[PDB]
Coordinates of all heavy atoms in Angstrom, one line a residue:
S29 N -5.2 -0.4 -1.9 CA -4.4 -1.6 -2.1 C -4.7 -2.3 -3.4 O -5.1 -1.6 -4.4 CB -4.6 -2.6 -1.0 OG -5.9 -3.2 -1.0
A30 N -4.6 -3.6 -3.5 CA -4.9 -4.4 -4.7 C -4.2 -3.7 -5.9 O -3.6 -2.7 -5.8 CB -6.4 -4.4 -4.9
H31 N -4.4 -4.4 -7.1 CA -3.8 -3.9 -8.3 C -4.8 -3.3 -9.2 O -5.9 -3.7 -9.3 CB -3.1 -5.1 -9.0 CG -1.7 -5.4 -8.5 ND1 -0.5 -5.0 -9.1 CD2 -1.3 -6.1 -7.4 CE1 0.5 -5.4 -8.4 NE2 0.0 -6.1 -7.4
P32 N -4.4 -2.2 -9.9 CA -5.3 -1.4 -10.8 C -5.1 -1.9 -12.2 O -6.0 -1.6 -13.1 CB -4.8 0.0 -10.6 CG -3.3 -0.1 -10.3 CD -3.1 -1.5 -9.8
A33 N -4.1 -2.6 -12.5 CA -3.8 -3.1 -13.8 C -2.3 -3.5 -13.9 O -2.0 -4.4 -14.7 CB -4.1 -2.1 -14.9
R34 N -1.5 -2.9 -13.1 CA -0.1 -3.2 -13.1 C 0.6 -2.7 -11.8 O 0.2 -1.7 -11.3 CB 0.6 -2.6 -14.3 CG 0.9 -1.1 -14.1 CD -0.4 -0.3 -14.3 NE -0.2 0.9 -15.0 CZ 0.1 1.0 -16.3 NH1 0.1 -0.1 -17.0 NH2 0.3 2.2 -16.9
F35 N 1.6 -3.5 -11.3 CA 2.3 -3.1 -10.1 C 2.4 -1.6 -10.0 O 3.4 -1.0 -10.6 CB 3.6 -3.8 -10.0 CG 4.2 -3.9 -8.6 CD1 3.9 -4.9 -7.8 CD2 5.0 -2.9 -8.1 CE1 4.4 -5.0 -6.5 CE2 5.6 -2.9 -6.9 CZ 5.3 -4.0 -6.0
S36 N 1.6 -1.0 -9.2 CA 1.6 0.5 -9.0 C 1.3 0.9 -7.6 O 2.2 1.3 -6.8 CB 0.7 1.2 -10.0 OG 1.3 1.5 -11.2
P37 N 0.0 0.8 -7.2 CA -0.4 1.1 -5.8 C 0.2 0.2 -4.8 O 0.7 -0.9 -5.1 CB -1.9 0.9 -5.9 CG -2.1 -0.1 -7.0 CD -1.1 0.3 -8.0
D38 N 0.2 0.7 -3.5 CA 0.8 -0.1 -2.4 C 0.3 -1.5 -2.6 O 1.2 -2.5 -2.5 CB 0.3 0.5 -1.1 CG -1.2 0.6 -1.0 OD1 -1.9 -0.3 -0.7 OD2 -1.7 1.8 -1.3
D39 N -1.0 -1.7 -2.7 CA -1.5 -3.1 -2.8 C -1.6 -3.7 -1.4 O -1.9 -4.9 -1.3 CB -0.6 -3.9 -3.7 CG -1.4 -4.7 -4.7 OD1 -1.7 -4.1 -5.8 OD2 -1.8 -5.8 -4.5
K40 N -1.3 -2.9 -0.4 CA -1.3 -3.4 1.0 C 0.1 -4.0 1.3 O 0.3 -4.7 2.3 CB -2.4 -4.4 1.2 CG -2.0 -5.9 1.1 CD -1.6 -6.4 2.5 CE -0.4 -7.3 2.4 NZ -0.7 -8.7 2.4
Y41 N 1.0 -3.8 0.4 CA 2.3 -4.4 0.5 C 3.3 -3.3 1.0 O 4.5 -3.4 0.6 CB 2.8 -4.9 -0.9 CG 2.1 -6.2 -1.3 CD1 0.7 -6.2 -1.2 CD2 2.8 -7.3 -1.7 CE1 0.0 -7.4 -1.5 CE2 2.1 -8.5 -2.0 CZ 0.7 -8.5 -2.0 OH 0.1 -9.7 -2.3
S42 N 2.8 -2.4 1.8 CA 3.7 -1.3 2.3 C 4.0 -1.6 3.8 O 4.1 -0.6 4.6 CB 3.0 0.0 2.1 OG 3.9 1.1 2.6
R43 N 4.1 -2.8 4.2 CA 4.3 -3.2 5.6 C 3.4 -2.4 6.5 O 3.7 -1.2 6.8 CB 5.8 -2.9 6.0 CG 6.4 -4.1 6.8 CD 7.2 -5.1 5.9 NE 8.2 -5.8 6.6 CZ 9.2 -6.4 6.0 NH1 9.3 -6.4 4.7 NH2 10.1 -7.1 6.7
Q44 N 2.4 -3.0 7.1 CA 1.4 -2.4 8.0 C 2.1 -2.1 9.3 O 3.2 -2.6 9.6 CB 0.2 -3.3 8.2 CG -0.7 -2.8 9.3 CD -1.9 -3.6 9.5 OE1 -3.0 -3.1 9.5 NE2 -1.8 -5.0 9.5
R45 N 1.5 -1.3 10.1 CA 2.0 -0.9 11.4 C 2.9 0.3 11.3 O 3.4 0.9 12.3 CB 2.8 -2.0 12.0 CG 3.0 -1.9 13.5 CD 4.1 -2.8 14.0 NE 4.7 -2.2 15.2 CZ 4.2 -2.4 16.5 NH1 3.1 -3.1 16.6 NH2 4.9 -1.9 17.5
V46 N 3.2 0.7 10.0 CA 4.1 1.9 9.8 C 3.3 3.1 9.5 O 2.0 3.1 9.3 CB 5.0 1.6 8.6 CG1 6.2 2.6 8.5 CG2 5.5 0.1 8.6
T47 N 3.9 4.3 9.4 CA 3.3 5.5 9.2 C 2.3 5.9 10.3 O 2.7 6.5 11.3 CB 2.6 5.5 7.8 OG1 1.4 4.7 7.8 CG2 3.5 5.0 6.7
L48 N 1.0 5.5 10.1 CA 0.0 5.8 11.1 C -1.2 4.9 10.9 O -2.3 5.3 11.3 CB -0.4 7.3 11.0 CG 0.7 8.3 11.2 CD1 0.2 9.7 10.9 CD2 1.1 8.3 12.7
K49 N -1.0 3.8 10.2 CA -2.1 2.8 10.0 C -3.0 3.3 8.9 O -4.0 2.7 8.6 CB -2.9 2.6 11.3 CG -3.2 1.1 11.5 CD -4.3 1.0 12.6 CE -3.9 1.6 13.9 NZ -3.7 0.6 15.0
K50 N -2.7 4.5 8.4 CA -3.6 5.1 7.3 C -3.0 4.8 5.9 O -1.8 4.9 5.7 CB -3.7 6.6 7.5 CG -4.7 7.0 8.6 CD -4.6 8.4 8.9 CE -5.9 9.0 9.5 NZ -6.1 8.7 11.0
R51 N -3.9 4.4 5.0 CA -3.4 4.1 3.6 C -2.3 3.1 3.7 O -1.8 2.8 4.7 CB -3.0 5.4 2.9 CG -3.5 6.7 3.6 CD -3.6 7.8 2.6 NE -2.5 8.7 2.6 CZ -2.4 9.8 1.9 NH1 -3.4 10.3 1.2 NH2 -1.3 10.6 2.0
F52 N -1.8 2.7 2.5 CA -0.7 1.8 2.4 C 0.5 2.3 1.6 O 1.3 1.5 1.1 CB -1.2 0.4 1.8 CG -1.3 -0.7 2.9 CD1 -2.5 -0.9 3.5 CD2 -0.2 -1.4 3.3 CE1 -2.7 -1.9 4.4 CE2 -0.4 -2.4 4.2 CZ -1.6 -2.6 4.8
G53 N 0.6 3.6 1.6 CA 1.7 4.2 0.8 C 1.4 4.8 -0.5 O 2.1 5.7 -1.0
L54 N 0.2 4.4 -1.1 CA -0.2 5.0 -2.3 C 0.9 4.9 -3.4 O 2.0 4.6 -3.1 CB -0.7 6.4 -2.2 CG -0.6 7.0 -0.8 CD1 -1.1 8.4 -0.7 CD2 -1.5 6.1 0.2
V55 N 0.5 5.2 -4.6 CA 1.5 5.2 -5.7 C 0.9 5.8 -7.0 O 1.5 6.8 -7.5 CB 1.9 3.8 -6.1 CG1 2.8 3.8 -7.4 CG2 2.7 3.1 -5.0
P56 N -0.2 5.3 -7.5 CA -0.8 5.9 -8.7 C -1.1 7.3 -8.6 O -2.3 7.8 -8.6 CB -2.1 5.1 -8.9 CG -2.3 4.5 -7.5 CD -0.9 4.2 -7.0

């Protein structure tokens, strides 16, 4: 989650309770 320098990673903004509770969607 959180930001690495610019809106990229999930950041925990991938609506929890989805997928399987694992990771937050990733991006970088």
